[PDB]
Amino acid sequence: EKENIIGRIANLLAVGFLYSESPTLVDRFANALSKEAVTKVLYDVQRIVQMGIDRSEIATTTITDYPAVNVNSSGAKYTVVGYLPTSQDIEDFLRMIEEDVYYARKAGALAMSIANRIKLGSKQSK
Amino acid sequence: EKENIIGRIANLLAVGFLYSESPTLVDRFANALSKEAVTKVLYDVQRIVQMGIDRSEIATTTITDYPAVNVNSSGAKYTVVGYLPTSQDIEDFLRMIEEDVYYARKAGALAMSIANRIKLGSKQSK
Amino acid sequence: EKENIIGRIANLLAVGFLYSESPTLVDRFANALSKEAVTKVLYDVQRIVQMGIDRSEIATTTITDYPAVNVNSSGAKYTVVGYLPTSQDIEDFLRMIEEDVYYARKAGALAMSIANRIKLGSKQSK
Amino acid sequence: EKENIIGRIANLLAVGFLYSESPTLVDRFANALSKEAVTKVLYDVQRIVQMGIDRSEIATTTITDYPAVNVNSSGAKYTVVGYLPTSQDIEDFLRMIEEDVYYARKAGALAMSIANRIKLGSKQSK
Amino acid sequence: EKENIIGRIANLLAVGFLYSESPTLVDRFANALSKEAVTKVLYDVQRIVQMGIDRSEIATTTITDYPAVNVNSSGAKYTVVGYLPTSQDIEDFLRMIEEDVYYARKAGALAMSIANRIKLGS
Amino acid sequence: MISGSVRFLVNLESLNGVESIGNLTKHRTAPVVLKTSTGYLVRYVPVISGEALAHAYQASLVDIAKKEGLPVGSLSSQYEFIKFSTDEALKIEGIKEPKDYNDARRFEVEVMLKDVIADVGGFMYAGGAPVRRTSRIKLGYMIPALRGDEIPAQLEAQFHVRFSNKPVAIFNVEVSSALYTFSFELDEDLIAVPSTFGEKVKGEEELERQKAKRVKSAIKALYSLLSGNFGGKRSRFLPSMKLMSLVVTKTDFPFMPEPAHDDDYIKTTIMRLGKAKGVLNGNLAKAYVINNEGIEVGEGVTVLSTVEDLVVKLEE
Amino acid sequence: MISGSVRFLVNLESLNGVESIGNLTKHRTAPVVLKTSTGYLVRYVPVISGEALAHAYQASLVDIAKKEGLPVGSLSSQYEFIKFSTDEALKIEGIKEPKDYNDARRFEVEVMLKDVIADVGGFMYAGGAPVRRTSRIKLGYMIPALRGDEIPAQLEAQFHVRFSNKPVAIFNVEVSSALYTFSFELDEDLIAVPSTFGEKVKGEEELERQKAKRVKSAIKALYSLLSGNFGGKRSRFLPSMKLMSLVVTKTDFPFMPEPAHDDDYIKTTIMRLGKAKGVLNGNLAKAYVINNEGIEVGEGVTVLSTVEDLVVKLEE
Amino acid sequence: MISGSVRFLVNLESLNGVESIGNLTKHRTAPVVLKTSTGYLVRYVPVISGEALAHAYQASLVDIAKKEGLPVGSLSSQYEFIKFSTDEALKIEGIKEPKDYNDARRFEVEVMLKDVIADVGGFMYAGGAPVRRTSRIKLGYMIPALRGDEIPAQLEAQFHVRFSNKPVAIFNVEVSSALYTFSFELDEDLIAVPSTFGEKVKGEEELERQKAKRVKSAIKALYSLLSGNFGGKRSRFLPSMKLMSLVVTKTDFPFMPEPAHDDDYIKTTIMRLGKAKGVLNGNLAKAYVINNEGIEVGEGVTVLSTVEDLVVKLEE
């Protein structure tokens, strides 16, 4: 269940990165040494995702069925496979961070891997 | 009991956000650096909820049974699962804020998670 | 003892709000920036409560035993649990306001919480 | 499957080394005595590869067909044969490191062998 | 193919020894009792060879044609006859070491023989 | 008799060296064969010989005996355990050589009265009429447990340099860290008893009087071995030992416990103790167990906490 | 005897070095076997050799002896502890080599009346008549506590550059941080006492006269080791040290305190000391404890505050 | 000796840098082991290397020596402290390389009469006859106080852009804020004294004449370190520094004050100084304390107000 939470946090970070086209929040998350830095990124990335939801540029979908998130940014279309974190996942993840900030680095490494694979595939098709 | 208080404050913020369609109070709460900013948001969000109660657009209910709050806004129907804070929860939460303003960020992060999940589900059904 | 004074104050503001069906005095109290505004509300709310007492529409009671105040307004019956402030509580509260107007915001937030919970319960019944 | 994961991690390290012209990340990886050092290198090398992807100096290709990665650095062209690791390969590799840090030394030795063979061939053709 | 792999590892060790003028890595390789010691030497010798490649003091060549490696440790020019190991040779050699650390001693003995013959001729 | 199986944990240790090559001091290793799904793997694993333990035990016995006034030989007072082997050794102590076979027993008794170490430790005299005495304490090689599919032992080389102001200074030492196990046997019943047939010779009454003291000293000498006062290179490479598991059996008949190479070796030895007492018509059978790694023990065993209590109970 | 166990906390540390690769200076690392809830594992952890501690102790002893008027050897006056191993040292000091075995004692006395370092730390002479003297102070490697499932130690590399106005200057340094533990043991009852067996030789009266001063100096020399004056690279990488726990035991019989690996290693060693005094027929057993981390100690134990008080109490 | 412990509070700081990734400039970070009520933990915290402090101290010493007329080396006149390591520096300065070991002292004197920096901060020459001189000032890494369970330090990244009228200019800078602590040591009794052993060489009279001025300059040079003139990126990221606590001890014997990690580290170090003077047979022990945070100090302690008063008192 800890790995599932970390994977859902990594999906949130990857969606926020692909939508904003900025690595800055993922960099801050993977370099965090305190719960303050982690929590600030968790808010700021969800605030970016909230704008994408309100603009209908971020939407949940199913793809062949697996749960996925469609992201439209600057005329590029991306699809992240998996769920976004629940409020309980954020709370349980913050408790994991209060024990060991290592889990922020693990989620950041996964998020960057998701984003890199999607960006590589999108450039190849173009 | 501290987590239950924070969760009930997060439900109040999420109800106020969904009813007003404005993130401004949640943004102010999550960025608070003083007890003044937190207390001002706790009043302003409850004042918004009070208008929704008087209009019968905000009501307590049970859903399959879990306690919930129904919110009607702009022809959209939302349901937040959980209780709203008591006067004692507000007072105990303000005492927690007088010790550490971190708890306002925790409640804001939870509130935004609740609101985002509900908005995503409502857009998918439409 | 400061929290007990603030609580009794809340109770007076909540009784005055439920009896008058007007938030205007609580709004003025929670937005006060001077001792003048606070003192004016403390008089005006007690003047409203005095009319309710003379009409026998506001009465002290015990409820299972806790001290309470019964309020009859527009055919609605409300019960606020707790004591009303003494003359000494008003004088000590005004001394607290002369040090920090924050205590008026604290009392206003508590009063609105009491009133909201009572109004929600009354609408649900039936 | 463990050898395939190690080989894909070695390809990532070799691509990062050839693009950055710096052995420092491979040195850190092969000398790692903790999961912290390994995870830090896995982030930093992927961050270097991400810059090369954004600049279109790192691209996936096929060569006679085998999967390959083209790397352009300082006017030199290199081709690494194989796939880059997936997010699942990074996660499974980190689990292997949590059991035995030996796998970081194995991946580092393979990465340096790939880079050395490519650098030797490029100098001979010049 | 096992003897060809061992011979290519011995060529790598001999090139590293002739370039560094130090027997220490060959001594460590020939005395290894664990996969850890062998793998550490395989990295350190390749790191020395990488510096010689970057300085253009180690280069692949052909000599009469046999594949060879030229090594300049300054004016001291040496030529080792044969190929350097591939990444697959290192991986297959490490698998041989995981079965029997004897193969590290065999490669070390061959490497020292190559280096001694070249130093005597020079 | 007394039998024991003990499990040890040692870190950053170099106690038993071997022949030096070049400028390197090497550790003592032995080959083992490990079974894998693919096949078999031959691995070299560090060991400690059974002679250093005997030397440490004899030195501790000498130190304990000289405090209580028991007789000690001249060459054994110095830590040189040549014992009464050749004529030169006998010349210093002042013992006449045996005359013929029939007198051999007498000679033994004389030796047995002039040196306690020659009694408990045992001695051999080469010559026309040899005399023998088997050791009363039996020790085995210290080899780490071959448990599971992994050997918990390593061996590395460390580089050391000496500083001088006029260079014209380099050496290497092998260090190891393993999980050792060893077993031992002792027969306190045969102490102060001659080991040659014949007729009783004058002087056996002194041995009968000294039997109790010799037995007590021999039992006491086990404390040094069980505490970790063996081996060499303790001046600069002092190790860090620790006790994990210990089983000691006291019986009135031959018996030994199982080797401590498996994770469950106390239940087996208890069951075998019961079965052997059933068949050999024994009377006394007691087992003392010290457990620190939390392995299964069984039922019908007194549990101790330290090694001193074990020695006290053994002496009682 | 005086036996001690000490725990230290050190951060941003590099006092011991090994062979360098490229532009990287490496820190000494060793394998350790550690027990976790899942079994036993092997890890690689930075360590510090005991030879540096011995060198620091000997240098402090040299300084104290020179200050107090005790004789110091010519070569040992400079901080070069070659002692009397080679013939060049003997020629420089001016001591004739031993002729036969019977003269060895004389040679030892001649070495022992000139340098206190040879007396305390022992020495070796190799030749026709080899002479040996074991050190009276015993130390070991400095290993971090193997407590729990996670080792409280970390190692990393740091980047440094040298400035120059005409580039034509880059290096890396390894830095570690850990919670170290180590134990020590010195026998003050054998200081200023010859070890080679033989007859009386003129000059032992001076040794008997100076025995008290030599013992006092040897006890005083432990202050440097207990304070933190050891290791290299102190010019630019001065470490931050802080004492956490210390146990010192003074006995008339051999004893070894528990290693500082478990949180409860003071009560155990005190109980073991009491039982060992009971069983070994001792006559003196004292314990001193310095605690700064609020762990369990026990009852009836003297509690100190600093290390200087401990040194004064040991001297008295 | 002069040993000091200093506590600083710095906000919005970036004085030390490391390798950069992309458009991000990183701040040096190191692992630290910290003790909490739940045990021991490992954290990553920004730190500042001691080499920058050494460079600032040496530059200030160069300035003071040039102002006071003391000799300064040609290469050291420019702020490039290569000293006399390579042969190019020797050729530029004009000093012949040592021939054999016996000449080494002469070479040292020739280096010592030309540059005060080589005398104070030490130097190294590598070759046929290597020459070493350890620095007389010792510093360490600057680490924030490890007090309580929360580390009072924070690090973040900041965004910056470069303006241009024709876009075709974006970077990030790491900024930290912490409460730093560091300690230093300086032995003034060995300044202007040769370290290589040998015979007397002409030119030592000049060193004896200039010893007082060299010591005075070395003491004066500490003002820059105690004030806050160190580190880079001061043109656009000038930090805000404020002294909080300072302890300085002057002794005739080795001593080390407690690190500034605990709130009570002045009373402890004063008591330790008194006991160390008592036990080590010293003849001089003085302490100076500067306090601006209202923590416990003790009794019978001189209290100052600024740093200039401390420098004047040390000089006098």
Coordinates of N, CA and C in Angstrom, one line a residue, chain H residues 123-174:
Chain H
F123 N 53.3 24.3 4.5 CA 53.5 24.1 3.1 C 54.0 22.7 2.9
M124 N 54.1 22.3 1.6 CA 54.6 21.0 1.2 C 55.4 21.1 -0.1
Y125 N 56.5 20.4 -0.1 CA 57.3 20.2 -1.3 C 57.5 18.8 -1.6
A126 N 57.2 18.3 -2.7 CA 57.3 16.9 -3.1 C 58.4 16.7 -4.1
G127 N 59.3 15.7 -3.9 CA 60.4 15.5 -4.7 C 61.4 14.4 -4.1
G128 N 62.6 14.5 -4.5 CA 63.6 13.6 -4.0 C 63.8 13.7 -2.5
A129 N 63.7 14.9 -1.9 CA 63.7 15.2 -0.5 C 62.5 16.0 -0.1
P130 N 61.4 15.3 0.2 CA 60.1 16.1 0.5 C 60.3 16.8 1.8
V131 N 59.6 18.0 1.8 CA 59.6 18.9 3.0 C 58.1 19.2 3.4
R132 N 57.8 19.0 4.6 CA 56.5 19.2 5.1 C 56.5 20.2 6.3
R133 N 55.4 21.0 6.3 CA 55.2 21.9 7.5 C 53.7 22.0 7.7
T134 N 53.2 21.5 8.8 CA 51.8 21.5 9.2 C 51.4 23.0 9.5
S135 N 50.1 23.3 9.1 CA 49.6 24.6 9.4 C 49.4 24.8 10.9
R136 N 49.7 26.1 11.3 CA 49.5 26.5 12.7 C 48.1 27.0 13.1
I137 N 47.2 27.0 12.1 CA 45.8 27.3 12.3 C 45.0 26.2 11.8
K138 N 44.0 25.7 12.7 CA 43.2 24.6 12.3 C 41.7 25.0 12.4
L139 N 41.0 24.8 11.3 CA 39.6 25.1 11.2 C 38.8 23.8 10.8
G140 N 37.5 23.9 10.7 CA 36.7 22.8 10.3 C 35.4 23.3 9.6
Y141 N 34.6 22.3 9.2 CA 33.4 22.6 8.5 C 32.4 23.4 9.3
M142 N 31.6 24.3 8.7 CA 30.6 25.1 9.4 C 29.3 24.3 9.4
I143 N 28.9 23.8 10.6 CA 27.7 23.0 10.7 C 26.7 23.7 11.6
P144 N 25.4 23.7 11.2 CA 24.4 24.2 12.1 C 24.2 23.4 13.3
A145 N 23.8 24.0 14.4 CA 23.6 23.3 15.7 C 22.6 22.2 15.6
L146 N 23.0 21.0 16.1 CA 22.2 19.8 16.1 C 21.4 19.7 17.5
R147 N 20.7 20.7 17.8 CA 20.0 20.9 19.0 C 18.5 20.4 18.9
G148 N 18.0 19.7 19.9 CA 16.6 19.3 19.8 C 16.4 18.2 18.8
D149 N 15.1 18.1 18.3 CA 14.7 17.2 17.3 C 14.5 17.8 15.9
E150 N 14.5 19.1 15.8 CA 14.3 19.8 14.6 C 15.6 20.6 14.3
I151 N 16.1 20.5 13.1 CA 17.3 21.2 12.6 C 17.0 22.6 12.2
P152 N 17.5 23.6 12.8 CA 17.2 25.0 12.4 C 17.9 25.5 11.2
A153 N 17.5 24.8 10.0 CA 18.1 25.2 8.7 C 17.1 24.9 7.6
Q154 N 17.3 25.7 6.5 CA 16.4 25.5 5.4 C 17.1 25.9 4.1
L155 N 16.7 25.3 3.0 CA 17.3 25.5 1.7 C 16.2 25.5 0.7
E156 N 16.4 26.4 -0.3 CA 15.4 26.5 -1.4 C 16.1 27.1 -2.6
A157 N 15.3 27.1 -3.7 CA 15.8 27.6 -5.0 C 15.1 28.9 -5.4
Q158 N 15.7 29.8 -6.1 CA 15.2 31.0 -6.5 C 15.4 31.2 -8.0
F159 N 14.4 31.9 -8.6 CA 14.3 32.1 -10.0 C 14.8 33.4 -10.5
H160 N 15.6 33.5 -11.5 CA 16.1 34.7 -12.0 C 16.2 34.7 -13.6
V161 N 16.0 35.9 -14.1 CA 15.9 36.1 -15.6 C 16.9 37.2 -16.0
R162 N 17.4 37.2 -17.2 CA 18.2 38.2 -17.8 C 17.4 38.9 -18.9
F163 N 17.3 40.2 -18.8 CA 16.5 41.0 -19.8 C 17.2 41.1 -21.1
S164 N 16.5 41.1 -22.2 CA 17.0 41.3 -23.5 C 15.8 41.7 -24.5
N165 N 16.2 42.6 -25.4 CA 15.2 43.2 -26.3 C 14.9 42.2 -27.5
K166 N 15.8 41.3 -27.7 CA 15.7 40.3 -28.9 C 15.8 38.9 -28.3
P167 N 14.7 38.4 -27.8 CA 14.8 37.0 -27.3 C 15.1 36.0 -28.3
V168 N 16.0 35.0 -28.0 CA 16.4 34.0 -28.9 C 16.3 32.6 -28.3
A169 N 18.7 32.7 -20.8 CA 18.5 34.0 -20.1 C 17.7 33.7 -18.8
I170 N 17.7 32.5 -18.4 CA 17.0 32.1 -17.2 C 17.9 31.2 -16.4
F171 N 18.0 31.4 -15.1 CA 18.8 30.6 -14.2 C 18.2 30.5 -12.8
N172 N 18.7 29.6 -12.0 CA 18.2 29.3 -10.6 C 19.4 29.3 -9.7
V173 N 19.2 29.9 -8.5 CA 20.2 30.0 -7.5 C 19.7 29.4 -6.2
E174 N 20.5 28.6 -5.5 CA 20.1 28.0 -4.2 C 20.5 29.0 -3.1

